[PDB]
Amino acid sequence: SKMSDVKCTSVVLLSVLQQLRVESSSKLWAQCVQLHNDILLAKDTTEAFEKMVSLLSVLLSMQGAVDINKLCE
Amino acid sequence: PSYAAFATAQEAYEQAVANGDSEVVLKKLKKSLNVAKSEFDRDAAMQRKLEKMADQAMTQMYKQARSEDKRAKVTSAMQTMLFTMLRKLDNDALNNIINNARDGCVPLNIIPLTTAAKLMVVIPDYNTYKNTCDGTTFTYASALWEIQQVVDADSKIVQLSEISMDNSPNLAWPLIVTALRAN
Amino acid sequence: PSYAAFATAQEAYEQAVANGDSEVVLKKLKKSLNVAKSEFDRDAAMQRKLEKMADQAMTQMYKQARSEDKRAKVTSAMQTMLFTMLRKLDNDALNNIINNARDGCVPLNIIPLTTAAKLMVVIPDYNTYKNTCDGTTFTYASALWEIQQVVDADSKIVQLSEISMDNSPNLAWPLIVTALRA
Amino acid sequence: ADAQSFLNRVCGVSAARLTPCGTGTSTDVVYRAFDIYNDKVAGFAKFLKTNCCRFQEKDEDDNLIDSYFVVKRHTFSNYQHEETIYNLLKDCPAVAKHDFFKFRIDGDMVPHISRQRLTKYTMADLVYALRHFDEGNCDTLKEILVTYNCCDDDYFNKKDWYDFVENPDILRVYANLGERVRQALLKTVQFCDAMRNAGIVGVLTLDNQDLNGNWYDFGDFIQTTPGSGVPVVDSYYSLLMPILTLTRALTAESHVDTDLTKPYIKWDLLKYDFTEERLKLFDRYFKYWDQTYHPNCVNCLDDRCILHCANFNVLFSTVFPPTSFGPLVRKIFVDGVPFVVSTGYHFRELGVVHNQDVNLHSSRLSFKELLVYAADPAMHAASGNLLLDKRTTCFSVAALTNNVAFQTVKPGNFNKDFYDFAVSKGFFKEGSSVELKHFFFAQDGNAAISDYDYYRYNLPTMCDIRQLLFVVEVVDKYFDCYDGGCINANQVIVNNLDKSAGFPFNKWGKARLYYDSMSYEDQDALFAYTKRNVIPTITQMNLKYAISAKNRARTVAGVSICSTMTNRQFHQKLLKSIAATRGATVVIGTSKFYGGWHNMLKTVYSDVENPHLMGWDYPKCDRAMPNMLRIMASLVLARKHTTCCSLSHRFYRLANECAQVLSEMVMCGGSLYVKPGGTSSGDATTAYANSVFNICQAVTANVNALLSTDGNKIADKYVRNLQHRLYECLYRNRDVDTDFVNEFYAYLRKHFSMMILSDDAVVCFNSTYASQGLVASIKNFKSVLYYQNNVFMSEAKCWTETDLTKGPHEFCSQHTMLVKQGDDYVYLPYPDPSRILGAGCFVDDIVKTDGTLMIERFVSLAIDAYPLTKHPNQEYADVFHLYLQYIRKLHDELTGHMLDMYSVMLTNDNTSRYWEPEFYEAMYTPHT
RNA sequence: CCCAAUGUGAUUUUAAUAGCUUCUUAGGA
RNA sequence: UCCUAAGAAGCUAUUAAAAUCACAUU
Ligand SMILES: [Zn+2]
Ligand SMILES: [Zn+2]
């Protein structure tokens, strides 16, 4: 069921970015919102997985905002 | 508590009409049964009101305590849920950027989708460089990228011919690589 | 009272149930006991009704005593707002337009245009900046205005040297420009 | 052979270079629009014209031009009459040149009239093309736009180049007709003065004026004593009215000497009273209208004079400066310190209005006077900064703060325990017929002002007033069921007091604070001020956080407590009477449960003959609604106040709606903006004013269907007489004919049976009449909305059904099934399965993601899911059993956690009834 | 920051209505 | 002594209203 799992992961990923105070940077929040809303409207999984790689790269660029080496165990 | 009086009264009343005892005695028994039943119902109404009141208090304590437990832990729950869902998708591009990020190989930009777009990535050590850079090329997010410049931590430019095992102690790590999407 | 009549009738009946052997006197004791008990349960029921009605009256009085507080509290906040706004009006600039009116009356929409000391301009893109504000002074509403500050959509200060065709991708649009009447 | 001798006589004395436009001696045949009323036909319709020969000019370099000589055959007695009338008006510059001659055909002399240098099309062809619009039949509109240089012939290759919403540049291409239409309005006032002075009597009709403005037909005029002539103009002006604002005709009145080559007029900035300018504009263009015009509606005689005079004010208010309208303020003294306060209002529709209870000196303020002076925008806007916001075209008043505010919307919370349960039951597999489509979409800081700028679709719109004043009396017949009137503050009902009070009152408390602080004599004293004075008020815009299938932002308008408290005391007795009624046209207050959906559908089917069903859509409905139709809706709701209010109290109440919920200031991000029109969601009357608008547009479509059908081809003598009387009741009677208003309502209620709820409707209609043209169809709504609502209605969002055993395709987002329930069949509603699964997966608060706290939530969603169990698709029938199986799991987990926490079981075992179908089936069986 | 109206589900309190028991009083035998 | 007619007290059920809360339509 990978299309519904990608759309459900999009909602959880933007909820994590919002709690990390990304709304405090208007030019960054406006890109995260557009990647999220596109993944929800997508119809082919090969589009939705490319936009998921851009949206996740926001969270990985915020060095020290998540303990990724502990979350990834 | 008045049940004992109710139980003994109904047994004595049914025994009296079964044996055919005198009607004034059967009336004394029936009338005793009516007040004993009324005392049993009056006791039962008290316990049923106290049990109703305790069931509400126990329920409201459960809702109050568990609602506060949901609300207080939300940040740790969301991050744990996210890094659980990314394992079930099992996409190679998502796995490739997460497995690089464990080791400190992270992007400075949002990763671009269009051809010939700019990307910048941190390289912590030669032992990481060797797994992702190959000649003029760089491999990240399960795609091929072409390198256009590299810098020391002091912003001094470094040529791709300088980055080798024997020379690696002389470079000022972490390096920053700039690359473009190939197509 | 009726209770003491009930309690004394209970003892008078109960001593005859215990040792008394005459139902005749038991029937007289029972009728007088049930009368006293009936008057006691009637007095207790009337007492209980008046008590439950008194708690309704006291909680109604507390609801009124707390509603007259909130009326007086909000009245003080409304007067504090209205009498503060009178300090922001530049009465010399407002008297000039109201005395020039034929009948002492004017449209509301012309009051900020003709009397305000300060202007905010909200700008969506650099083409709109260049067409309206380029430089340090500009003309709008038939007056001359001088720029004291610029800020971005994050409320960070922008210096006028940063706003250009080359650097415009690096700014958080819209910009807000604040100016004073020359 | 002979035709060259005819062609040379048609040229005559004049310098001309004519070419034949058909066969030379016989007449040409053309299809053209006519405004007609005879003893045997009436309407505004297309007919064949067959009496005329035609010739077209070449120029001096061999190219054809827009100049025709039109020649026709006469009976000799009509030829002498039309020559006798022409020689009296011959000196007028608004009259087309004529030549009268006799010529030989078939061996005999025949009389001819030639009419010189006419255009291809008439003023009736332009009016009929912009009314009655079809995007696949534009050929006359395209040729008029190209002939008069409005656009190049390449313009029509755009996708939807006519859609006002998708191609808003069409408002520039149509406004290039404006000065051509204004020159035609001026030539008509010259022709009326010529008829009057010459002593001539007759009717002016649009088919006798060319597109250069010249008048050319006199065969039905009569003589009278000189200086006593009478031009009749009632259809000419009324039928043309909606084109005057569409083509922006009076735009030249804004320039010096009214010359489009000179600069704009600079008005005195302090000026608010334009009464002498409005009276001068009326005498220039509408001189012979023959009904009294009041520039200020406070002078009008009744509701029908208010609608008449306001229609000229929406036209003339386009000339005057935008800063002139809105609240009018004065300086007053309270305890010796000077306040600025509103003491009147200037309206684009109602003119200038002044307050009757103004005090210039006061020693103290009551609690009632503190509400009025805090709600009034005067003190807020006079003490704020000047604002120039370049993000919008809407007018900006002031910034109330030193900073701008940007409001985001965050994503929904994910209920993972329900999604993992549904996936284990085999939901969401790829290629399944049930999938997720409803989500919570996030929004960035630009969203609030980006949604506000959609008020750019509200445009000044002038109605056909002779049509509108008939339609209002047939719309009022739908509201004869009910009762209404004023009530005291002790009779008012409020649903929830812990909701916002609007601006500024939300600084200090919820609506509860004001209903507790105001005694009933303070509340009844505020209502009595609004019958003698105008309170203008501020409204907040807030973004909405709720689930949807579309990603555009949604906003809600929070109306102020002064407006909310007093509108509720004027209208609530009627609104409670509309909701309590059953079997009516307006179905507000009726439930779908306990057999209510079946009773609604059995009522709309009525006793209609040859029945089909349809339903239709309103594009941009809340933004695009005209002010002339939102004023008409509140004048219909006020017709219940005939005993409790005078004519003066009813005017000052209307002014209070127009100052508070129609044209008012808007708080959006800490700044004030001027709203042009359209419905505000917090208006207490919104669902009821929408229902009156929805009936008005459906009555209008049936008048246009019947009046534009060719009356010679109607086979039934009853419907010919209905068409002939309908034309008189619009364009020739001037009082209400009550017996015809009852007869047209009785016709309409049989052949066109409606069920209406706010902006949503179903109709059951006679399909034999609708295909003959005797009642409305989906093309008549497309034509009306195009010129009336100024929006293009795509047929892709309309529907129709041929089989009544299927029911309506959609009403209130729910589909229908006919199903067996006991011994007989009933209609049941069902939702979209993706809306019911979406509400299980996505939630607006974090504590909604533990189901043991929330079992009441899943019982409510299973009541809506139940009808899906009777549907033929098993993937829909499984959605109800998913909800019942999850409710059992939640009670088993709740029972386990309660025992682990307290070592004692719950005593309420009665939760067992909620995982069995019998509790839910009882919601859809009759007799409760 | 968080509008308006309508409908439905659940829990709690209060009023009325019926039966059920006892007490008191009065008529008839 | 029994039958009966009325009032009070208690018990039980039902209906209505109010408060609180969930969901749905526009
Ligand atoms: Zn009038
Ligand atoms: Zn009234």
The Cα A58–Cα A37 span in angstroms is 16
How far, in Å, is the CA of D573 from the C1' of nucleotide F13? 38
Please count the CA atoms within 13 angstroms of the CA of D678 that sit on its side-chain side: 21
Q: Which nucleotide lies at the shortest CA–C1' distance from D540?
A: E3
Query: How far is residue D313's CA from residue C1's CA, in Å, rounded to a whole number?
Result: 86
Q: Are B141 and B111 within 8 A, CB to CB?
A: yes
Residues in B lying within 8 Å of D, measured between beta carbons: 51-52, 55, 58-59, 62-63, 66-67, 70-71, 74, 81
CA D244 to chain centre: 17
Cβ(D176)–Cβ(D150) under 8 Å? yes
Q: C80 and C143: one domain?
A: no
Contact D904, B58 (CB under 8 A): yes
Does the residue D906 lie in any domain?
yes
How far is Cα of residue D763 from the mean position of the Cα atoms in its chain?
Answer: 19
Query: Phi, psi at residue D793, to the nearest 5°?
Result: -90, 105
Cross-strand partners of C180: C118, C146
Structure tokens at D913: 């009834």
d(CA D642, CA D651): 13
In this structure, the answer to whether residues D610 and D711 fall within a common structural domain is yes
For D296, the enclosing helix (H) or strand (E) is none
**Smallest Cα–Cα separation from D695: which of D614, D744, D654, D753?**
D753
In a domain, C24, yes or no: yes
User: D755-782 burial, b if ≥16 CB within 10 A, otherwise e?
Assistant: bbbbbbbbbbbbbebbebbbbbbbebbb
Q: Name the one residue in this structure whose structure tokens are 């079930």.
A: B88
Report chain B residues whose CB lies below 8 A from the CB of D852.
66
> Does residue D407 approach strand E to less than 7 Å at its CB?
yes
Domain range for C136 = 117-181
Q: Which two tokens stand for residue D216?
A: 């050319």
Chain F footprint bases within 7 A of protein beta carbons: 2, 7-12, 20-26
The 3-state DSSP class for residue D703 equals helix
> Which nucleotide, over all strands, has the C1' atom closest to the CA of C34?
E23
How far, in Å, CA of D70 to CA of D20, rounded? 11
A-chain residues near D436 (CB < 8 A): 4, 7
Cross-chain CB nearest to B89 (options A9, A15, A57): A9
> Is D758 marked active-site?
yes
Resolution (A): 3.0
Is the residue at B105 inside a domain? yes
* B104 shares its domain with B176: yes
Contact (CB, 8 A) for D668 and D399: no
**Phi and psi, residue D328, nearest 5°:** -105, 125
Under 8 Å between Cβ of D541 and D682: no
Instruction: Give D75-84's long-range contacts (Cβ < 8 A, gap of 24+).
Output: D76/D111, D78/D219, D79/D111, D79/D113, D81/D219, D82/D113, D82/D218, D82/D219
Please indicate, yes or no, whether residues D703 and D787 belong to a single structural domain of this protein.
Answer: yes
- C-beta separation of D156 from D135 below 8 A: no
The answer to whether the beta carbons of residues D314 and D245 sit under 8 Å apart is yes
Calpha distance D583→D604 (Å, rounded): 9
Residues 6+ apart with CB under 8 A from A21: none
Residue C68's Cβ-side half-sphere holds a number of Cα atoms within 13 Å equal to 5
- Name the domain boundary from D784, D808, D832: D808
Strands of chain B, DSSP E: 118-123, 133-134, 137-140, 143-151, 175-181
Output the distance from B38 CA to F13 C1' rounded to whole Å.
17
Compare all CA atoms of chain A with the CA of B140 and give the residue at the minimum distance: A53
List all residues 6 or more positions away from D572 whose beta carbon is below 8 Å from its beta carbon. Answer: D487, D492, D493, D684
Give domain status of residue C91, yes or no: no
Q: How far, in Å, CA of D865 to CA of D882, rounded?
A: 10
Chain E bases near protein Cβ (<7 Å): 1-12, 21-25
Q: How far apart are CA D916 and CA D885, in angstroms?
A: 9
Number of domains chain B contains: 2
Pair D323, D269: CB distance under 8 Å? yes
Is C22 in a helix, a strand, or coil?
coil
CA distance D331 to D409: 42
> What number of residues does chain D have?
928
| Ramachandran area for residue D920 (φ above 0: left; ψ -120 to 50: alpha; else beta) | alpha
Same domain, D600 and D736: yes
- Is C171 found in the same domain as C125? yes
How many CB atoms neighbour CB C154 within 10 A? 14
Asked if D329 lies within 8 A of C108 by C-beta distance, the reply is: yes
Q: Is residue C22 part of a domain?
A: yes
Strands B133-134 and B137-140: antiparallel
Residues of A in contact with B82 (CB under 8 A): 9, 12-13, 16, 71
Q: What is the DSSP string of D595-620?
A: THHHHHHHHHHTT-SSEEEEE---TT
Task: Determine the protein residue whose CA lies at the shortest distance from the C1' of E12.
Answer: B56
For residue C130, give Cα distances in angstroms to C133, C134, C161, D434: 6, 5, 13, 52
Note the Cα D243 to chain centre separation in Å.
16
ω into residue D504 within 30 of 0, thus cis?
A: yes
Give the CA dihedral C79, C84, C86, C92, nearest 10 degrees: 170
Does residue B99 share a domain with residue B174? yes
Tokens of B69: 């437990």
- CA atoms of C93 and D246, how far apart (whole Å): 42
**Closest residue by Cα to residue D862 from D889, D887, D893:** D887
**Domain count along chain A:** 1
Answer yes or no: do D876 and D734 share one domain.
Answer: no
Number of alpha carbons in the 13 Å side-chain half-sphere of residue D875: 13
Of D464, D421, D374, D388, which is closest to residue D703 (Cα–Cα)? Answer: D464
Beta partners for residue D508, in sequence order: none
**Residue D5 annotated as catalytic:** no
Q: Which of D473, D43, D466 is closest to D237 using CA atoms?
A: D466
**Does residue C163 lie within any of the structural domains?**
yes
Residues B100 and B173 in one domain: yes
Structure tokens at D608: 């209609």
- Does residue D58 form part of some domain? no
D694 is in an annotated binding site: no
User: Is residue D828 domain-shared with residue D902, that is, in the same domain?
Assistant: yes
Neighbours of A64 (CB within 10 A): 6
Smallest CA-to-CA distance from D152 within D136, D173, D172, D180 is with: D173
Residues of A in contact with C153 (CB under 8 A): 26-27
User: Which is it for the CA torsion D891, D897, D899, D905, positive or negative?
Assistant: negative
Q: Which two tokens stand for residue D58?
A: 């070449």
User: Is the domain of D797 the same as that of D843?
Assistant: no
Compute the CA torsion angle D894, D899, D900, D901 (nearest 10 deg). Answer: 90
Give the whole-angstrom CA distance, residue D387 versus residue C174: 14
Instruction: Please tell me the distance from the alpha carbon of residue D414 to that of residue B80, in angstroms, as a whole number.
Output: 13
Cα dihedral angle (D859, D863, D865, D866), rounded to 10 degrees? 120
Domain total in chain D: 2
Residue D154 C-alpha to ligand 1 middle, in angstroms? 46
Q: Looking at the domain assignment, is residue D910 inside a domain?
A: yes
Measured between alpha carbons, how far is residue C119 from residues C115, D18, D666 in Å?
11, 66, 19
Q: Active site includes D606?
A: no
Whether D410 sits with its Cβ under 7 A from any strand E atom: the answer reads: no
Domain containing C172 — which CATH number?
Answer: 3.30.70.3540
Q: Which of residues 33-92 of B touch strand F (CB under 7 A)?
A: 38, 41-42, 44-45, 48
CATH of the domain at D695: 3.30.70.270
| Residue at D437 is within a domain | yes
Contact of A20 with chain B, judged by CB distance below 8 Å, is answered with: no
Strand blocks (E) in D448-601: 539-543, 555-558
The three state secondary structure string of chain A is CHHHHHHHHHHHHHHHHHHCCHHHCHHHHHHHHHHHHHHHHCCCHHHHHHHHHHHHHHHHHCCCCCCHHHHCC
Is beta strand D815-821 parallel, antiparallel or unpaired with respect to D337-347?
unpaired
- In angstroms, the CA D386 to CA D284 distance is 39
Say how far apart CA D118 and CA D213 lie, in whole Å: 10
Residue B164 burial class via C-beta count within 10 angstroms: exposed 0-12, middle 13-18, buried 19 and up = exposed
Tokens matching residue D620: 């941009």
Tell me the technique behind this structure: cryo-EM
Give yes or no: residues B107 and B170 share one domain.
yes
Is residue B83 one of the residues assigned to a domain? no
**DSSP label at D432?**
-
Q: Residue B85: helix, strand or coil by DSSP? A: helix
In a domain, C100, yes or no: no
Query: What count of other Cβ atoms lies within 10 Å of the Cβ of residue B86?
Result: 20
The alpha carbons of chain C give a radius of gyration, in whole angstroms, of: 43
CA–CA dist D34, A56 (Å, integer): 67
> For the residues of D203-261, what is the DSSP string, one character each?
E--GGGBBTT--B---TT-EE-STT--EEE-HHHHHHHHHHHHHTTGGGGGGBGGG-TT
Residue in D with minimal Cα distance to A31:
D444
* Max Cα–Cα distance, chain D, nearest Å: 122
Structural domain containing residue A50: 1-73
Q: Is D797 helix (H, G, I), strand (E, B) or coil?
A: helix
In a domain, C112, yes or no: no
Sheet containing D200-203: which strands, arranged edge to edge? D222-223, D200-203, D230-232
* B42-49 own/partner pairs: CB under 8 Å, 24+ apart: B42/B2, B43/B1, B43/B2, B43/B3
Is residue D847 situated within a structural domain? Answer: yes
Same structural domain, C67 and C123: no
Nearest nucleotide to the CA of D760, by C1', is F26
Judged by phi (left if over 0) then psi (alpha if -120 to 50, else beta), residue A36 lies in alpha
Task: Indicate the residue of B83, B106, B112 with minimum beta-carbon distance to A71.
Answer: B83
Q: Which of C3, C11, C8 is CA-nearest to residue C38?
A: C3
CA triple D804-D806-D808, angle to 5 deg: 80
| Rg of the Cα atoms in chain B | 42
Same domain, D602 and D747: yes
Nearest to B71 among D847, D897, D904 (CB): D847
How far does chain C reach from its first CA to its final CA, in angstroms? Answer: 93
Among B44, B72, B100, which residue terminates a domain? B72
Chain B CB contacts of D901 below 8 Å = 62
Give all chains having 3 or more CB-to-CB distances under 8 Å with chain B: A, D
Segments in B90-119 forming alpha helices (H)? 92-102
Whether B107 and A63 lie within 8 Å, measured CB to CB: no
Which of D660, D669, D670 lies closest to D634 in space, CA to CA?
A: D660
Q: Considering only CA atoms, which of D196, D219, D215 is closest in space to residue D207?
A: D215
Please report whether residue D1 resides in a domain.
no
| Active-site hit among D28, D759, D832, D850 | D759
Helices D520-527, D367-375: axis angle to 10 degrees equals 50
E strands along D59-198, which residues? Answer: 64-73, 98-105, 108-118
Q: What secondary structure letter does DSSP report for D265?
A: P
Q: How would you list the strands of the sheet with D64-73, edge to edge?
A: D18-20, D52-58, D64-73, D108-118, D98-105
How do beta strands D665-667 and D539-543 pair?
parallel
Residue written as tokens 């036209």? D315
Could you write out the three-class secondary structure of C74-133? HHHHHHHHHHHHCCCCCHHHHHHHHHHCCCCCEECCHHHHHHCCEEEEEECCHHHHHCCC
Q: What whole-number distance in Å separates Cα of residue D86 and Cα of residue D216?
A: 9
Q: Are residues D728 and D849 in the same domain?
A: no
Query: Is there contact between D591 and strand F, defined as CB under 7 Å from any strand atom?
Result: no
How many helices (H) and strands (E) chain C has is answered by 5, 5
Which of D444, D543, D844, D845 would best serve as a mutation to test chain A binding (most A beta carbons within 10 A)?
Answer: D444
| D346 marked ligand binding residue | no
C-alpha D661/C-alpha D689 separation (Å) is 12
Domain membership of residue D900 as a residue range: 420-442+813-921
Residue bearing tokens 């009759």: D926
**CA B36 / C1′ F6 distance in Å:** 27
| Burial profile D448-483: b = 16 or more Cβ within 10 angstroms, e = fewer | bbebbebbebbebbbbbbbbbbbbbbbbbbbbeebe
- As beta bridge partners, residue D728 has none
Query: Beta-carbon neighbour count of residue D414 at 10 Å?
Result: 22
Cα–Cα nearest to C111, from D331, A7, D750, D878:
D331
With a 7 Å cutoff on the CB, does C15 touch strand F?
A: no
Instruction: Judge if the beta carbon of D859 is closer than 7 A to nucleic acid strand E.
Output: yes
Contact D361, D333 (CB under 8 A): yes
Q: CA D392, CA D446: separation in Å to the nearest integer?
A: 12
Q: Which of D755, D767, D775, D857 is nearest to D816 (CA)?
A: D755
CB D656 within 8 A of CB D535: yes
Residue C14 and residue C58 share a domain: yes
